DNA sequence: ATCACATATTGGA
DNA sequence: TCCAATATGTGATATAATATAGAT
């Protein structure tokens, strides 16, 4: 009950098998198994035999050096201003070569480096934190002191990072999202930092700016993951977490239907056939005494042109189903009540050319739509329990206007029916 | 027969379309628009523009065993030869580069990669268009914008006056135009360029005490500092358009100043360089490079399309003088009046080549401690025959023929759009005015031809419209304001 | 504001320079701006009609629009002499000609249909160019090939003329819908052309869908029509599966890839990178070899016949002719290699042009010239429709019936005006027919015209005086039966309310038609109807199971574009607003089951498909697993890379 | 007390016919109790509360799902300005995660 | 005609908002609509 | 885009229906299939023959147990027919060191001349 | 009767205004309804007669005109005896007065709204989600009217 | 590019 | 000396169907 955002320590999750050592993705004209597109770790794009889920996570180990956790970086930036000058390393030299900066215009804490920053993090935090405006952030940093510095960086599956090895006449081409570049960059840096012995003293100008640039690249990785993969209409949050592309869906034009109940509609041949295809294959396999693949052959032959046997099966299914082969009809935009209606199929149209959902006229006002040709979306409901659950969207439940507890005029007579009744009674 | 009478009535109709307008796409030639873009590279002193011409297309096939390949998709194109000459350290090399360009088909279409693409006229302001607190002139690459700021300055007698200080926002910095003019000509040369050497003077406090009361009665005095002051004639101050220059001059002068500093051109160059960068040692070089870039902002095509007198079209400084002295009148002009607008066709097709050339020349100008000849070669290293065609298609500058019927007169031939390269229109809300209709559109632009997907961005020209011949496809021969 | 003050009504007197598209709309003075904008969009949304007719009520600016639009007709601007004619197919040939004046050589190609985009195109009337033989002469103005929109005398018509009435047919006209008779539905038919490419490699082979045991044809010939809505089908060949799958190559199997299209073939072009000898060996691709040899023979003919013209130094050849000759010479040249999408392709690639006649169907949109959009609700027998049984006009039936509720509210009075004028034109024509004197007929006609448009009256007087007596009799008779042209210019020369008042008070005999079984006496009259591009086939989609994305979630495929599928199979998106509306039902478990089984979870999807495939067809009850959804896995991985992990409290 | 009256008066001015109970629910969801406990309404006097705008209401609220799946994901995950880590309240929209 | 809705409302209150009375309301709406179509086709409506 | 799932599910359910038919027809228990499968390894020629027999009905599944069930069903149905050697071929196991039979010109030409 | 060229310009300008308005409202309506629906999605209802809400805590409303009285139907109010009693919309005695009413905003139940604070409409709308009903009822007429 | 939100200087008081 | 105003800069964010394609 409920959801809580929690910080995670990658040290418990890390698996040595999912370790990337090669920054260059291509090796001998094929994708490297030690790169960011590793088929052994992440999986294969078009192979069922690999059997690697998208949940698989990869790791880049920056040991023995450490880095600021990017997600917390922003918070730290408010507690310790000008942290960027502190983590970056800069030193000047004389003609003879002696360090000549003399610290005339810079604070003693600035330009020390990321390693000095980690060594002096506590006292610097006490120096630059302002309680009045950042006491809560400083407390959060105290509570999560372990998560502040990390040595391992995660990289998500290559199926989410599109990578195509296309072949061109003049030259081969590689299509990748920019995020990959950043990842690769990090790897390269750590390699050039680890090939040199860390115990042996080396020039700081060769090592510390590399760490600062690595931190910048990791910050950009996090920012790009948020700004591309996880935010907006394009983002996985709005697109596929709440919404989704739905199988067993149809899109049909609307036309007036006469002489039928208000919740009963006429459905064209092709749409009902494809939407209810598997049930029809079951029925054919039982009726004709053949296996399911031959029933699929018969359905394939019947979807081309009108077949009387297939339409007889369709009407049999419409009549004998318990719930009644019901569906949900929606008109975009669904900005009003009654935009989505739980309706029932009562007739399968006998003409292959006719491809129009026959909807009742009284249903127009609830849908807030007209016969302008705009397409309505149809989602068939199969499960009986789901039928009883979505029956609350039936026209009967919307007959009672929820504002006043009275009869809803949206389901009453339209203006033409009103003219007819008025001529009759007045 | 009824058909006979229909044909007779149709042929006897008095009102007839302008055939020349229908086939105006035939009139446009690629070389005339291509010459200025090639000339842009003459910024580099070594580059010399020999010229551009169409290479003969009369080539005939010959039986070969070379195993040549041909694409299944068919494209009808023409080839343009561009000839440049580059000389470095008395070593000269002649460079010839060929670019493919769409060839007109059926007098109104192009065929590229097995697809029917039809070009579309774009509607753009002629020059000096008005935006909120600014006057803008659009050059080929960098637009020149002048922004006005309402400022208040107290008279020496204590009576405050409200004036307008105008400044340029070129190179991402708000610099007064007087700074540029001071760096170019000096303060004395700047006053003489505007012909104001008799009207404005700068003098010492003791000299002010020496001046008689009649001169104070005939002049307006603003003390820059306690030590030095400025005097401007009252008749000059009576005009607000002249008050603009005085306000800019007051904003330029600083409290820490010297008479010899005002006389020093290097001080103005240093102030400009300080506007752009804070490094004191290279401020002079920064200002010099900025003045060079300012000289290079103007292009010859912009000179030609401008309707002002050629005396004001000699160089960029003349254009800024013309704008500033007529700023109050030019600012009070309608952005949507068709007389202030024009239509263009082939010009927006050549813009990617201009962008590529500008990238190369920015590389060469900013190159440090390397062989100049090498970078000049890199300018034309990857120029390929299919570059222009690919850039035209992929950038979606050309419109694919989505026509559903045979009627093409109103869906393709007469289609105008505000969107495109150097777009004055965008999907943002404040541009709503551009979507609307203007009374000057009557008799020239269709009133109900807008598209429902993006209202106001698209429309159709009236068939009875006649553009003035030899008027650069402007709607009107002369602009809205005639500067009487 | 006062800016509009610049507009002077006196300056635009007797002028139509402000009108553009609206020029094709009669009585544009009376229509509102919204309906006019709708008409301007409809002109683009219009489709070519097989039975196009010139408008009965016209503006006379229409023929100009037809002339200046160059996509429908071809004109040989100079005088030409036919040098030669060479046949690629029976439907497509090429004419090499020479300008008699300039001396340059030029080219003219013919074809049964022209394709614009998608499935939109039109048929041609190639009779004028087909009458031309070698050494014939083309004049300075000649229509070599024309569209169906243009008639014999180059009159241009974008739609048909249909007898309409404002009627409420069993509430089938609610909102705005149209019920049309079958006879009128025949007149509202259009063309559908499709350019479908099927690519064959060495792995896949074609199937004997067309022909018998002796004759192996995998695709229809040029003259043949499509059967079973399949242009072809291909099977991948592998030696392991060859023993059983290759047998019965005549019938379809589940492994085959089919290609869907419907109509009549009119041009096939095959580009082959395979050695011709190997094709000679293969029996299944024999038809491909035959058409390859046909193209090569046509190119050999053009080379042999135009080498003297192209390679003559003292000769001028048009760039089109030169490019055509060069392409054919490349095709006949050895070591020729074809590339598609900048890539050498295996096997061959076949491009088919398919043409069919598609009629009016339910859901198809037809509109008038005044923004009166409408969707065809019912196509009914012409007998089961309003028929008049009183007076001289007995037996007349209504071709279309329109909604009469909000005609005034739509602010489009010109619809009613056109209907009224054609309705009174019916009476004028009947009065002409009853008279036995030709002079009396022309007197009645000139009277009515002078009452409507005076300039048309003067022009018709001149035209009648110029005609021969037999030609005048033909004119009168065809006017009596087919209809009378009436001119209502858009802005100046239109017929207003007072003119119609005068017309109605003069013709006292004219009154509403009393129709069978209908109490209200109504008016029937011809108005112009055009067909719009939007149709039930345009946005129809039906997906059950289709290709899954790389992320395991449903996504669209390009199969419908490549004609590999019959319907779109495009997945619908459940929006966030749709989720909010569905949340009215407080059964979030059922909504989550819907989304998981249809999209998010693979295991639930497989379970659903298995339950529907085997079990009780009439009572379907499913039990779903609680395995985490793939969307939840992707979310978990992304947040893990962020450094955060959502955990339930 | 005055925002409900302003809402009803503006509804009458616009002609929109919606019962005031639904409008009261709309306004109730916008307000946030400083105590964040409904039981304080049982006390004698009205508890401490603060009414927010519709965008700030769910962002400054205590539900993780309706805030993460709505607007400003970046500022929620990077900064604690919205106190996102402290949110623990449940929602039906949680099942979509 | 304006009172028709009221009747329906009272109907919903008279039978205790039963599901059956709601079904009957929907049936009455359908039948009345069919008869309205009949009246409209037999007794024509026209604008001129 | 990867391949669609529905048609593969159709084929797999057809295979399951066939093995259920086989189990019901001969009253097969797990012990009888164990007797037929006792110490039996996968044979390429055997899976090829199984593909050939059911080539009109479905496509073979990857699970070896399903293929062995289909093997027993094919063996029984072929034994009902006059065919005799092929069931025994299915029952036995192939040798790991498979040796291709040298080409028999007399036998090959006799088969070529055969009317079948 | 006809039109003039100046009148035609005015008419076309109005039509362009209408199209621009439609284009912008297409974008605005979804945003507004999305915010309100996302906030009110979690509104609930419980079957408890009395939540213990204080009578003094019941907020007040001014019966200024007839429409304000029309807004409150199936709504409770406190008489001068001190007992909760239903409101009858037809009675005009309440006009010109200020009445304190049990309100959903003053509900003291954290689990959900009680039967008293929602009113007698509870049993009618208990089948569907309440906040969604509310947001739809507010968002449809407003956007359509605009 | 519109709206919000937050700093940086600066003329002003 | 301080400060509120101005100004600059930062940051989120955006409809609806749809034609593709940088030396030897
Ligand atoms: Zn309560």
User: Got the DSSP string for B280-349?
Assistant: STTHHHHHHHHHHHHHHH--HHHHHH--S-GGGGSSHHHHHHHHHHTHHHHHSS-SS-GGGEEEESGGGG
Spatial CA neighbour of B98 closest among B392, B386, B390, B398: B386
Q: How far is the CA of B403 from the C1' of I24 (A)?
A: 56
Q: How far apart are CA C18 and CA B461, in angstroms?
A: 10
Q: Which of A150, A375, A351, A165 is nearest to A254 (CA)?
A: A375
| DSSP letters spanning G21-54 | HHHHHHHHHHHHHHHHHHHHTT--B---S-----
Residue closest to B392 by CA, chosen among B341, B355, B360? B355
Are the Cβ atoms of C9 and G128 closer than 8 angstroms? no
Residue linked to tokens 């309906």: C35
| A382 torsion bin: left (phi>0), alpha (psi -120 to 50), beta (else) | alpha
Query: Which nucleotide C1' is nearest A226 CA?
Result: I12
Pairing assessment for the beta strands C486-487 and C644-648 based on DSSP bridges: unpaired
Nearest to A264 by CA among A344, A368, A376, A196: A344
What is the residue whose two structure tokens read 């499935």?
Answer: C119
Give the chain B residue whose CA is nearest to the CA of C480. B2
C1 and B CB contact within 8 Å: no
The Å distance, CA of B174 to C1' of I9, is 15
- At residue C292, the 3 state secondary structure works out as helix
What gap in Å lies between CA C121 and CA C112, rounded to an integer? 11
Tell me whether residue A2 is exposed, middle or buried, using C-beta atoms within 10 angstroms of its C-beta: 0 to 12, 13 to 18, 19 or more.
middle
**Cα D89 to middle of ligand 1, angstroms:** 20
Tell me whether residue A201 is exposed, middle or buried, using C-beta atoms within 10 angstroms of its C-beta: 0 to 12, 13 to 18, 19 or more.
exposed
The C-alpha angle with vertex B244 and arms to B242 and B247, in degrees rounded to 5, equals 120
Per-residue tokens: F13:
């359910």
d(CA C183, CA C187) in angstroms, rounded, equals: 7
* Nearest nucleotide (CA of B429 to C1'): H2
d(CA C346, CA C344): 7
Residues β-bridged to residue B343: B123
Radius of gyration of chain E (CA): 15
Considering only CB atoms, which chain A residues are within 8 Å of E32? Answer: 413, 417, 421
Tokens of C522: 């109504």
Say which experimental method was used: X-ray
Asked if the peptide bond before residue C480 counts as cis, ω within 30 degrees of 0, the response is no
Which value in Å is the resolution of this experimental model? 3.4
Q: Which chains touch F (3 or more CB pairs under 8 A)?
A: A, C
Residues 6+ apart with CB under 8 A from A372: C176, C373, C375
Q: Which two tokens stand for residue A318?
A: 């419409």
**How far is residue A240 from each of residues A234, A362, B73, C632, G20, measured CA to CA in Å?**
9, 34, 39, 10, 32
Q: What does the alpha-carbon distance between residue C126 and residue C113 come to, in Å, rounded to a whole number?
A: 10
CB crowding F6-25: b at 16 or more within 10 Å, else e:
beebbbbbbbbbbbeebbee
Q: Which residue of D has its CA nearest to C577?
A: D70
How many CB pairs lie under 8 A apart between chains A and G? 35
Query: What is the b/e burial string over B156-180, where b = at least 16 CB atoms within 10 angstroms of the residue's CB?
Result: eeeeeeebbbbbbebeeeebbbbbb
Of B9, B449, B18, B412, give the one whose Cα is nearest residue C59. Answer: B9
CA distances from G1 to C13, C31, C371, C417, C422 (A): 18, 11, 19, 11, 19
- Asked if B6 contacts C64 with a C-beta cutoff of 8 angstroms, the reply is no
Query: Pick from B6, B61, B400: which is nearest to C485 by CB?
Result: B6
Q: Is G119 annotated as a binding residue?
A: no
Contact call for A4 and D69, based on CB within 8 A:
no
| Nearest-angstrom CA–CA distance, G48 and F19 | 59
Is some CB atom of chain B closer than 8 A to the CB atom of C276?
A: no
Task: Return residues with beta carbons within 7 A of strand I.
Answer: A 227, 231-233, 333; B 113, 115, 149, 174, 382, 390, 393-394, 396, 400, 402, 427, 453-454; C 117-118, 341, 561; D 71-75, 78; G 23, 26-27, 30-31
- Residue C22: name the closest of A156, G38, B464 by CA: B464
Please give the Cα distance from C262 to C220 (Å, whole number): 11
The DSSP element (H or E) to which C645 belongs, if any, is strand C644-648
Tell me the nt nearest to B382, Cα to C1': I22
Considering only CB atoms, B446 lies closest to which of C3, C20, C338, namely C20
Q: Which of C412, C580, C587, C590 should be substituted to probe chain G, the one whose Cβ sees the most G Cβ atoms within 10 Å?
A: C580
Check CB contact under 8 Å for A3 and D85: no
Q: Assess contact for B232 and B200: CB atoms under 8 A.
A: yes
User: What subunits make at least 3 CB pairs under 8 angstroms with G?
Assistant: A, B, C, D
Q: What is the DSSP string of B2-18?
A: HHHHHHHHHHT-S----
Task: Find how far residue B224's CA is from the centre of its chain.
Answer: 37
G66 known ligand binder: no
- Counting every residue written for chain A, the total comes to 426
Do the bridges between strand C486-487 and strand C57-58 make them parallel or antiparallel, or are there none, so unpaired? parallel
Q: What Rg do the C-alpha atoms of chain F give, in angstroms?
A: 17
CB < 8 Å from C in window 364-423 of A: 364, 370-373, 375, 377, 379, 381-386, 389-390, 392-393, 414-417, 419-420
Give yes or no for D77 touching A (CB within 8 A). Answer: yes
- The H helix count followed by the E strand count for chain G is 5, 4
- Residue of B451, B402, G7, G21 whose CA lies nearest to C40: B451
Nearest to D97 among C635, C644, C649 (CB): C635
Strand I: list positions under 7 Å from protein Cβ: 7-8, 11-17, 19-22
**Do the Cβ atoms of C28 and G3 come closer than 8 Å?**
no
Q: List the one residue out of A256, E37, E36 whose CA is nearest residue C374.
A: A256
CA–CA dist B149, B151 (Å, integer): 6
DSSP code at position C335: T
From CA A36, how far away is CA A154, in angstroms rounded? 11
Inter-residue contact C512 to C153 (CB < 8 Å): no
d(CA B100, CA B298): 28
Q: For residue C546, what are the contacts with CB-CB under 8 A and spacing of at least 6?
A: A247, C554, C557, C569, C571, F4
C-alpha dihedral sign at A181, A183, A185, A187: negative
Q: How many contacts does A have with F, using Cβ atoms within 8 A?
A: 22
G84 alpha carbon to ligand 1 midpoint, in Å? Answer: 13
In this complex, is the C-beta atom of C120 within 8 Å of any C-beta atom belonging to chain B?
yes
The pair of three-digit structure tokens given for residue B285, joined into one six-digit string: 């070089």
Q: Which residues pair with C156 in a beta bridge?
A: C150
Residue B111 CB neighbours (<10 A): 19
Q: Determine if strand H comes within 7 Å of the CB of B426.
A: yes
- The encoded tokens of residue C520 equal 């209200």
CA distance C166 to chain G (A): 22
Dump the DSSP string for C545-560.
S--B-TTSSB---TTT
- To the nearest whole Å, the CA of C332 is away from the closest chain B CA by 9
């Amino acid at each position: 009950m409920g959801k809580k955002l929690s910080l995670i320590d990658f040290n418990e999750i890390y698996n040595e098998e999912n370790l990337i050592t090669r920054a260059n993705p291509i090796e001998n004209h094929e994708f490297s198994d030690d790169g960011i597109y590793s088929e052994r770790i992440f999986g294969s794009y078009n192979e069922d035999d690999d059997d690697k889920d998208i949940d698989t996570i990869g790791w880049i180990n920056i040991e023995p050096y450490y880095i600021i956790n990017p997600i917390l970086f922003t918070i730290i930036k408010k507690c310790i201003p000008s942290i960027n000058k502190i983590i970056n390393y800069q030193q000047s030299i004389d003609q003879n070569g002696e360090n000549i900066d003399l610290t005339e215009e810079i604070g003693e804490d600035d330009y020390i480096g990321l390693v000095k920053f980690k060594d002096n993090f506590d006292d610097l935090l006490e120096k630059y934190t302002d309680k009045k405006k950042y006491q809560k952030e400083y407390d959060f940093l105290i509570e999560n002191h372990d998560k502040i510095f990390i040595n391992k960086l995660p990289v998500f599956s290559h199926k989410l990072r599109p990578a195509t090895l296309l072949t061109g006449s003049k030259g081969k081409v590689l299509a990748f999202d920019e995020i990959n570049n950043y990842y690769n960059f990090v790897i390269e840096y750590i390699n050039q930092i680890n090939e040199g012995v860390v115990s042996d003293d080396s020039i700081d100008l060769l090592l510390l700016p590399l760490l600062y640039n690595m931190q910048f690249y990791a910050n950009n990785i996090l920012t790009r993951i948020i700004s591309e993969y996880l935010r907006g209409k394009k983002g996985f949050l709005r697109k596929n977490i709440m919404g989704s592309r739905i199988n067993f869906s149809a899109r049909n034009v609307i036309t007036p239907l006469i002489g039928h109940p208000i919740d009963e509609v006429a459905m064209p041949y092709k749409t009902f056939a494809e939407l209810y295809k598997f049930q029809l294959i079951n029925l054919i396999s039982k009726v004709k005494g053949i296996n399911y693949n031959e029933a699929l052959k018969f359905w394939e032959k019947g979807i081309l042109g009108f077949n009387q046997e297939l339409y007889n099966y369709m009407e049999e299914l419409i009549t004998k189903t318990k719930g009644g082969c019901t569906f949900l009809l929606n008109r975009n935009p669904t900005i009003s009540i009654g935009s989505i209606l739980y309706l029932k199929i009562g007739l399968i149209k006998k003409d292959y050319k006719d491809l129009t959902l026959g909807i009742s006229n009284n249903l127009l006002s609830a849908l807030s739509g007209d016969y302008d040709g705009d397409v309505l979306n149809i989602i068939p409901v199969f499960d009986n329990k789901m039928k009883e659950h979505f029956s609350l969207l039936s026209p009967q439940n919307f007959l009672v206007d929820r504002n006043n507890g009275r009869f809803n005029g949206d389901f009453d007579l339209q203006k033409d029916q009103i003219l007819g009744i008025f001529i009759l009674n007045n | 027969m009824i058909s006979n009478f229909r044909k007779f009535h149709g042929n006897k109709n008095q009102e007839k379309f302008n055939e020349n307008l229908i086939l105006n796409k035939e009139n446009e030639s690629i070389l005339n628009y291509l010459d200025p873009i090639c000339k842009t590279l003459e910024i580099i002193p070594e580059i010399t523009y020999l010229g551009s011409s169409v290479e003969p297309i009369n080539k005939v096939y010959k039986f070969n065993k070379e195993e040549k390949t041909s694409d299944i998709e068919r494209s009808e194109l023409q080839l343009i030869k561009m000839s440049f000459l580059i000389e470095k350290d008395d070593k000269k090399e002649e460079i010839n580069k060929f670019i493919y360009f769409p060839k007109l088909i059926d007098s109104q279409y192009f065929i590229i990669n097995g697809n029917r693409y039809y070009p579309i006229y774009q509607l753009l302001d002629s020059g000096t268009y008005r935006t909120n607190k600014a006057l803008t002139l659009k050059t080929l690459l960098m637009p020149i914008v002048l922004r006005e700021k309402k400022e208040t300055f107290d008279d020496i007698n204590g009576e405050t006056h409200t004036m307008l200080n105008v400044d340029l926002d070129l190179f991402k910095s708000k610099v007064p135009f007087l700074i540029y003019f001071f760096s170019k000509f000096g303060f004395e040369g700047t006053l003489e360029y505007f012909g104001l050497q008799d009207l404005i003077h700068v003098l010492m406090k003791e000299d002010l005490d020496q001046l008689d009361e009649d001169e104070i009665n005939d002049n307006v005095i603003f003390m820059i500092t306690k030590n030095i002051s400025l005097v401007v004639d009252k008749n000059f101050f009576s005009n607000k358009n002249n008050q603009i220059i005085i306000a800019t001059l007051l904003n330029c002068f600083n409290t820490r100043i010297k008479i010899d500093k005002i006389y020093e051109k290097d001080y103005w160059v240093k102030k400009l360089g300080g506007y752009f960068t804070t490094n004191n040692s290279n401020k002079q070089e920064k200002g010099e490079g900025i003045i060079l870039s300012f000289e290079r902002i103007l292009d010859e095509w912009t000179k030609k399309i401008l309707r002002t007198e050629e005396k004001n079209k000699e160089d960029i400084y003349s254009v800024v003088r013309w704008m500033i002295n007529n700023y109050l009148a030019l600012v009070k002009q309608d952005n949507m009046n068709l007389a202030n607008k024009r239509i263009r066709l082939y010009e927006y097709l050549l813009h990617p080549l201009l962008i590529k050339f500008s990238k190369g020349t920015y590389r060469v100008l900013n190159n440090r401690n390397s062989n100049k000849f090498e970078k000049i070669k890199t300018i034309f290293s990857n120029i390929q025959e299919g570059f222009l065609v690919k850039k035209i298609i992929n950038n979606e500058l050309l419109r694919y023929d989505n026509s559903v019927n045979s009627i093409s007169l109103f869906t393709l031939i007469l289609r105008y759009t505000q969107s495109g390269p150097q777009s004055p229109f965008s999907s943002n809300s404040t541009n709503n005015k551009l979507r609307g209709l203007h009374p000057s559109y009557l008799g020239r632009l269709g009133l109900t031809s807008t598209s429902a997907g993006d209202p106001g961005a698209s429309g159709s020209l009236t068939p009875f419209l006649e553009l003035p011949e030899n008027s650069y496809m402007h709607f009107t021969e002369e602009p809205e304001i005639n500067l009487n | 504001m006062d800016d509009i003050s610049v507009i002077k009504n006196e300056d635009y007197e007797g002028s139509h320079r402000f009108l553009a598209e609206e020029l094709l709309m009669p009585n544009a003075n009376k229509t509102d701006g919204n309906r006019s904008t709708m008409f301007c969009s409809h002109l683009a949304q219009a489709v070519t009609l097989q039975k196009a007719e010139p408008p009965l009520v016209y503006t006379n600016f229409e023929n100009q629009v037809g002339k200046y639009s160059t996509a429908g007709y071809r004109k040989a601007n100079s005088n030409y002499k036919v040098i030669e004619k060479i046949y690629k197919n029976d439907y497509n040939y090429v004419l090499i000609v020479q300008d008699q004046e300039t001396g340059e050589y030029t080219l003219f190609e013919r074809a049964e249909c022209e394709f614009l985009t998608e499935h939109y195109g039109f048929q041609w009337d190639n009779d004028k160019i087909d009458s031309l033989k070698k050494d014939d002469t083309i004049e300075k103005d000649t229509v070599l090939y024309k569209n169906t929109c243009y008639d014999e005398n180059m009159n241009f018509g974008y739609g048909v003329n249909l007898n309409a009435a404002y009627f409420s047919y069993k509430n089938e006209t609610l909102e705005d819908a149209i019920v049309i008779s079958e006879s009128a539905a025949k007149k509202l038919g259009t063309f559908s052309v499709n350019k479908v490419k099927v690519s064959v490699n060495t792995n896949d082979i074609l199937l004997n869908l067309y022909g018998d045991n002796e004759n192996y044809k995998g695709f229809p010939d040029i003259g043949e029509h499509i059967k079973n809505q399949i242009i072809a089908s291909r099977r991948r060949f592998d030696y392991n599966t060859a023993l059983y799958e290759l047998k019965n190559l005549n019938e379809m199997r589940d492994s085959d890839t089919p290609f869907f299209a419907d109509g009549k073939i009119v041009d096939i072009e095959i580009f082959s990178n395979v050695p011709e000898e190997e094709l000679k060996v293969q029996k299944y691709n024999e038809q491909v070899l035959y058409y390859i040899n046909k193209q090569k023979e046509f190119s050999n003919n053009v080379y042999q016949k135009l080498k003297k013209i192209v390679e003559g130094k003292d000769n001028n050849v048009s760039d089109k002719l030169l490019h055509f000759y060069n392409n054919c010479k490349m095709r006949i040249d050895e070591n020729i290699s074809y590339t598609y999408q900048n890539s050498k392709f295996s096997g061959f690639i076949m491009e088919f042009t398919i043409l069919e006649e598609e009629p009016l169907n339910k859901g198809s949109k037809i509109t008038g010239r005044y923004g009166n959009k409408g969707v065809i609700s019912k196509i009914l027998p012409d007998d089961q429709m309003p028929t008049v049984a009183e007076g001289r006009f007995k037996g007349l039936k209504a071709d279309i019936c329109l909604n009469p509720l909000g005609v005034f509210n739509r602010l489009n009075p010109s619809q009613l005006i056109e209907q009224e004028l054609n309705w009174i034109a019916k009476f004028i024509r009947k009065d002409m027919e009853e008279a036995g004197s030709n002079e009396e007929k022309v007197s009645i006609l000139l009277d009515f015209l002078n009452r409507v448009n005076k300039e048309e009256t003067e022009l018709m007087e001149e035209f009648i005086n110029s005609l021969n007596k037999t030609e005048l009799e033909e004119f009168l008779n065809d006017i009596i039966e087919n209809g009378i042209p009436i001119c209502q210019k858009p802005f100046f020369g239109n017929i207003g309310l007072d003119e119609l008042w005068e017309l109605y008070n003069h013709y006292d005999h004219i009154d509403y038609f009393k129709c069978e079984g209908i109490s209200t006496p109504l008016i029937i009259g011809e108005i112009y109807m055009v067909r719009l591009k939007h149709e039930p086939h345009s946005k129809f989609s039906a997906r059950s199971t289709s290709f899954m994305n790389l992320r395991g979630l449903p996504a669209k495929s390009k199969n419908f574009k490549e004609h590999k599928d019959l319907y779109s199979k495009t997945p619908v998106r459940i929006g966030n607003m749709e989720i909010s509306n569905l949340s009215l039902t407080n059964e979030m478990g059922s909504i989550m089951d819907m989304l998981n089984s249809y999209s998010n979870n693979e295991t639930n999807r497989r379970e659903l498909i298995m339950q529907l495939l085997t079990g009780n067809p009439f009572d379907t009850n499913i039990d779903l697993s609680d395995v985490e959804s793939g969307t939840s896995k992707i979310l978990k991985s992304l947040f893990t890379c962020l450094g955060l992990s959502i955990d339930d409290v | 007390n005055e925002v409900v009256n302003y809402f009803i008066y503006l509804l009458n001015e616009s002609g929109i016919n919606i019962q005031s109970v639904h409008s009261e629910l709309i306004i109730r969801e916008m307000m946030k109790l400083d105590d964040s406990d409904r039981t304080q309404f049982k006390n004698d006097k009205m508890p401490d509360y603060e009414i927010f705008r519709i965008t700030d209401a769910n962002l400054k609220g205590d539900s993780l799902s309706r805030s993460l799946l709505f607007e400003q994901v970046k500022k929620q995950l990077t900064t604690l300005d919205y106190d996102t880590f402290n949110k623990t309240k449940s929602s039906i929209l949680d099942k979509l995660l | 005609l304006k009172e028709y809705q009221n009747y329906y409302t009272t109907l919903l209150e008279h039978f205790g908002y039963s599901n059956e009375i709601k079904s009957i309301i929907k049936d009455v709406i359908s039948e009345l609509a069919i008869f309205s179509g009949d009246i409209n086709v037999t007794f024509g409506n026209t604008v001129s | 885009l990867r391949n669609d799932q529905g048609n593969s599910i159709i084929n797999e359910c057809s295979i399951k229906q066939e093995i259920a038919k086989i189990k019901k027809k001969y009253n097969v228990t797990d012990e009888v299939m164990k007797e037929f499968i006792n110490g039996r390894e996968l044979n390429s020629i055997q899976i090829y023959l199984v593909k050939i027999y059911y080539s009109n009905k479905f496509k073979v599944n990857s699970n070896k147990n399903d293929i062995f069930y289909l093997l027993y069903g094919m063996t029984r149905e072929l034994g009902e027919m006059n065919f005799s050697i092929i069931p025994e071929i299915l029952s036995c196991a192939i040798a790991p060191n498979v040796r291709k039979m040298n080409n028999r010109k007399k036998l090959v030409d006799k088969i070529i001349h055969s009317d079948k | 009767r006809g039109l003039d060229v100046r009148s035609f310009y005015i008419n076309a300008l109005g039509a362009r205004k209408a199209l621009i308005t439609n284009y912008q409202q297409v974008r605005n309506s979804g945003y507004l309804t999305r915010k309100i629906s996302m906030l009110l999605m979690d509104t609930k209802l419980i079957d408890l007669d009395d939540c213990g809400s204080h009578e003094n805590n019941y907020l007040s409303i001014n019966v200024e005109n007839k429409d304000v009285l029309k807004r409150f139907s199936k709504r409770s109010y406190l008489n001068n005896n001190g007992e909760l009693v239903e409101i009858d919309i037809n009675d005009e005695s309440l006009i010109g007065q200020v009445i304190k009413i049990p309100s959903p905003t003053t509900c003291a139940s954290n689990e959900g709204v009680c039967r008293k604070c929602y009113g007698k409409l509870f049993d009618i709308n208990k089948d569907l989600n309440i906040g969604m009903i509310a947001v739809l009822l507010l968002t449809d007429p407003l956007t359509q009217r605009l």
